[PDB]
Write a protein that binds this ligand. Structure first.
Ligand code: NDP
Ligand code: NDP
Ligand code: CB3
Ligand code: CB3
Ligand code: UMP
Ligand code: UMP
Ligand code: CP6
Ligand code: CP6
Lengths: 511, 511
């Protein structure tokens, strides 16, 4: 019973020029060391590596301390390694075998009392052999989210859908996303499948007195996307069927919550492709205080079009509004709160309260202040808007370490469509604010009021819950030196790195 | 050998009056009793031991207790007196009579070994007194009836009866959430006499894996107050030390959530005495749109006085404000959002947005609407206020069963002083609205931004965490027929029932 341990690109790449394809990944190395070393006294673990993998290792690190090193080789000899460096006291000598079956034979013959676990450590020669013999019970795979130039690859395997889009290996463990040197990655483990409380017990039994799961097989759910996935499952299982303004049936819950880290990776949901071009353009649109939807529409972002049509503006009793005008919508209240609205063509400079500017100035001068808020909800202007703001409020917070966190409150949440878009939107805002204020992005916290999935999304979401999430990508602000104020950001100042989502799922917008 | 006591008790230890139960029927308690006394893992049954009067107080259709060996402690009653009282049913045990409790336990050893599993002392005072004297009681199943009733028979005094009211040991290991039947709140406690299937995943868990706890011995933490208590412990252990507007030190966290049920009982925190007169008078003050703090101060509610002094108004750069004038604060924005403020003496009827009326009218006509929000945050009027609103937004929600839920977002939360007050303040509003909209109150959900404990509260809070909570009280709206609109409520239309909190703890307000 052997296990495989690997770091791997989305296209199964593992090595180039007898070396690692990516810059150093410190956390992955700490992970490798820990898994391969840890034992419950009398026993040590066995690491089996190929010749080239042995050679790729720096001479300082080889042999891997506290582990029985085994090199599969025809050309190298046991003395070549013995003469490479003097053997340190209290360590087992490196054994060389012709093949992997021979390497396992040696473990049975000589070492059956000494070793607890066996690890195949690389490279492509040993992984392929181990997969051929079917001796692999588990696969410890570090999923490098970025693609790098490679000449050596891990062989394709039934269940390699965890890496990219296309006896079996099913994920049983998925971690949160880490990143080092601008390279996002996470850790998965795949399994070969094919009277202390006795007094309390009867009281609990009477009390309890009375279906849909996300990726049920995955037992450790470290990935932060599971929040969203369990949140879907939760509303489908425990929500209530309600009527709606849209006329479409809704299954709803009230007062749900999610929070996402921004220090390592970006919470751009991987279980379905997120229209990032849309989130970026809408946020930049918001920041300008622009209320003209045709500016978004001309850029290929048609997210507001169905709610600024002649027919919708008239159902909203605003026949004087031009097609496209969202009225005093989100952006207008951010930059000109309480200002008298005319149309989308009017210059509103200096008018109203510039909430965004006040939030930033307070962050840069007095970050312990507890009044760092930005609201889009204006009861006086609600009837003039094409649609009342969903995401209506956000608060900022700075800790000891100059780390910035953002809460956002949403009155109404379309889980299937709007939420993944809203997560990414305010998470992006946090990065942008964090940079302009000289702060580290830490956390985005999502507070939700009426949390609902539309009936016509249910089947499509059930499909989405069979999908095990991929590592979160990294969003980089480019041209950091040029950007000094929040208005300095443009569409091209952003780069989404290592985003490998599952395919797009069609979900109609409830008009 | 060891026995378990099962009781339903008044705060003053009362268990009975006129050879009967002091309170109206509590179905859930009667269920609890039935299940704990009956449940067994085949061949065995449990034994219930009672006094002569406890047997007599019991209805005839219920005695003997089915599927349980009944033992009566008596000197006058004989075994044939009971047998002639009712024909023994097939399968059931014959009721035994013993001259004492030690004689009862001796019979359980002599004739009923291999027959009985668990022994339960079931009353009354005579038997409870003896079982505590002998020291054979390993566990006490106590149903804490929060309401005081006329009683002539009492449960004996015991070390650790501090769980009932204010003043070898019996410490709580289980505290449930508050239930209520027939307007009588109660909960359940259990005391204790003290004086490679998944293992191939654990190594990766090991390296990813990592001081103050409230009532740590209590293992089952059903009581919803534990939310508040664990939130205190969480801030102290994991929070970050920041500076603050007031100058007083602060330990803080960001993005905290609590929720409290409103259907059974009221979340008026029991682990310290909450100034309820203050929560009621301030809320009615809000409802009136009153900005004059002297109207609260005349009634003995001085919660606002330290922020309306000549000194604080001037430090806010408001020299023209009369002493008491909070400016356009919560009350004002609720009933007159956007209205141009003059002073506290001006009549603003018909001016600005009446958010409260809009919320109620929407609830009564279109409850599936997702825009039922009320906000106090008005960035245009913030500088004119004496203090920017802490609790700045609340949203309402109605479901299938005409049940009302309410979320309140609070930008800044003084956990020691303000939080308990705010929980009661909006939970009371939810009651008030629910009645006026013909809806059942369901849940209050607390969303918290900058959640902090002041450094001069830390010692007093550590003391508070040693206290286990008491059952929640019921808040009754009196004169229901008279009250039809939200403005109809008065200070006299409310009744707190069964409130038994711990002693007040002095906590200075950071000015
Ligand atoms: N990211 C990751 O997880 C890891 C990546 N790597 C990378 O992979 C590369 C090294 O792997 P790779 O190039 O495949 O070389 P290997 O480590 O597979 O070793 C190849 C040599 O070992 C012997 N050998 C290997 N497999 C067998 C077999 N089944 N039977 C008999 N002999 C065998 C052969 O010797 P002979 O020719 O004499 O028969 C062969 O020349 C490096 O670039 C390294 O950086 C390495 C480890 C982990
Ligand atoms: N809420 C609750 O948890 C419960 C409440 N109750 C209430 O309490 C009342 C009954 O309690 P209480 O008034 O104390 O009466 P008890 O049930 O304790 O019975 C008293 C009688 O039982 C016999 N007895 C009891 N203890 C002993 C002893 N140690 N040695 C010898 N004989 C004993 C004696 O009967 P004799 O004179 O025949 O020898 C005595 O007169 C009722 O009103 C009932 O409603 C009862 C049970 C549970
Ligand atoms: C939230 C938000 C911003 N908005 C604004 C907006 C306006 C009204 C709404 N109305 C309703 N009922 N649901 C919404 O999600 C919604 C969203 C969006 C609007 C549409 C799409 C959309 O058509 N779907 C995208 C998929 C993006 C994704 O997967 O998240 C598409 O492919 O076109 C996205 C965002
Ligand atoms: C929140 C709120 C309303 N308010 C208004 C108010 C105004 C400014 C504040 N400022 C700060 N820093 N903390 C607060 O809690 C606070 C509260 C209150 C103010 C004081 C007390 C108070 O002195 N404590 C009560 C005990 C009440 C309790 O048990 O919680 C007392 O007995 O005096 C209560 C409520
Ligand atoms: O950023 C947004 C904007 C809109 N919506 C969805 C949620 C609501 O279902 C709908 C707005 O309709 P009302 O909540 O106004 O009924 O749009 C979002 O989820 N996110
Ligand atoms: O209803 C209230 C009023 C005040 N505070 C507390 C929280 C803050 O610690 C303090 C106000 O300080 P700033 O947030 O304004 O700095 O008062 C509350 O918790 N609830
Ligand atoms: C530390 C990188 C690493 N990460 C993972 N997840 N698996 C591995 N097998 C390795 C590895 C690294 C160097 C060598 Cl020489 C062999 C294997
Ligand atoms: C069901 C009320 C009840 N609740 C609790 N928690 N304990 C009890 N011992 C009883 C009880 C009730 C009736 C009799 Cl006759 C004896 C005991």
């Amino acid at each position: 019973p052997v296990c495989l341990v690997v770091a791997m690109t989305p296209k199964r790449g593992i090595g180039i020029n007898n070396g690692l394809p990516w810059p150093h990944l410190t956390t992955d190395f700490k992970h490798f060391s820990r898994v391969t070393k840890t034992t419950p006294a009398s026993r040590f673990n066995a690491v089996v590596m190929g010749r080239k993998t042995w050679e790729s290792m720096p001479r300082k690190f080889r042999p891997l301390v506290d582990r029985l090193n085994i090199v599969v080789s025809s050309s190298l000899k046991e003395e070549d390694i013995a003469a490479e460096k003097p053997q340190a006291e209290g360590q087992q000598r490196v054994r060389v075998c012709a093949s992997l079956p021979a390497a396992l034979s040696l473990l049975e013959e000589e070492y059956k009392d000494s070793v607890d676990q066996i690890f195949v450590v690389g490279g492509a020669g040993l992984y392929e052999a181990a997969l051929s013999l079917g001796v692999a019970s588990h696969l410890y795979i570090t999923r490098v989210a970025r693609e790098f130039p490679c000449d050596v690859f891990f062989p394709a395997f039934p269940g390699d859908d965890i890496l990219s889009n296309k006896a079996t290996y099913r994920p049983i463990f998925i971690s949160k996303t880490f990143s080092d040197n601008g390279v996002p990655y996470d850790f998965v483990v795949l399994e070969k499948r094919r009277s202390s409380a006795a007094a309390i017990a009867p009281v609990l039994a009477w009390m309890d007195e009375e279906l849909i799961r996300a990726v049920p097989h995955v037992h450790f759910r470290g990935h932060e996307e599971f929040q969203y996935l369990d949140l879907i499952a939760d509303i489908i299982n425990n929500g209530r069927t309600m009527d709606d303004r849209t006329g479409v049936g809704v299954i709803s819950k009230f007062g749900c919550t999610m929070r996402y880290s921004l220090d390592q990776a970006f919470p751009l949901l991987t279980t379905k492709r997120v229209f990032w071009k849309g989130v970026l353009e809408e946020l930049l649109w918001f920041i300008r205080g622009d209320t003209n939807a045709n500016h978004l529409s001309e850029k290929g972002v048609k997210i507001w079009d169905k709610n600024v049509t002649r027919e919708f503006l008239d159902s909203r009793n605003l026949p004087h509004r031009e097609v496209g005008d969202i009225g005093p919508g989100y952006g207008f209240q951010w930059r000109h709160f309480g200002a008298a609205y005319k149309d989308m063509h009017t210059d509103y400079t200096g008018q109203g309260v510039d909430q965004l500017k006040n939030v930033i100035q307070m962050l840069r001068t007095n970050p312990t202040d507890r009044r760092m808020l930005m609201t889009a909800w204006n009861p006086a202007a609600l009837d003039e808007m094409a649609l009342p703001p969903c995401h209506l409020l956000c608060q900022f917070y700075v800790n000891d370490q100059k780390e910035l966190s953002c809460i956002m409150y949403q009155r109404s949440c379309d889980v299937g469509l709007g939420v993944p878009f809203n997560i990414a939107s305010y998470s992006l805002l946090t990065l942008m604010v964090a940079h302009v204020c000289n702060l580290k992005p830490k956390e985005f916290i999502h507070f939700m009021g009426n949390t609902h999935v539309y009936t016509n999304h249910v089947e499509a979401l059930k499909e989405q819950l069979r999908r095990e999430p991929r590592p979160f990508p990294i969003v980089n602000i480019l041209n950091k030196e040029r950007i000094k104020e929040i208005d300095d950001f443009t569409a091209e100042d952003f780069e989404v790195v290592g985003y490998v989502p599952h395919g797009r799922i069609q979900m109609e917008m409830a008009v």
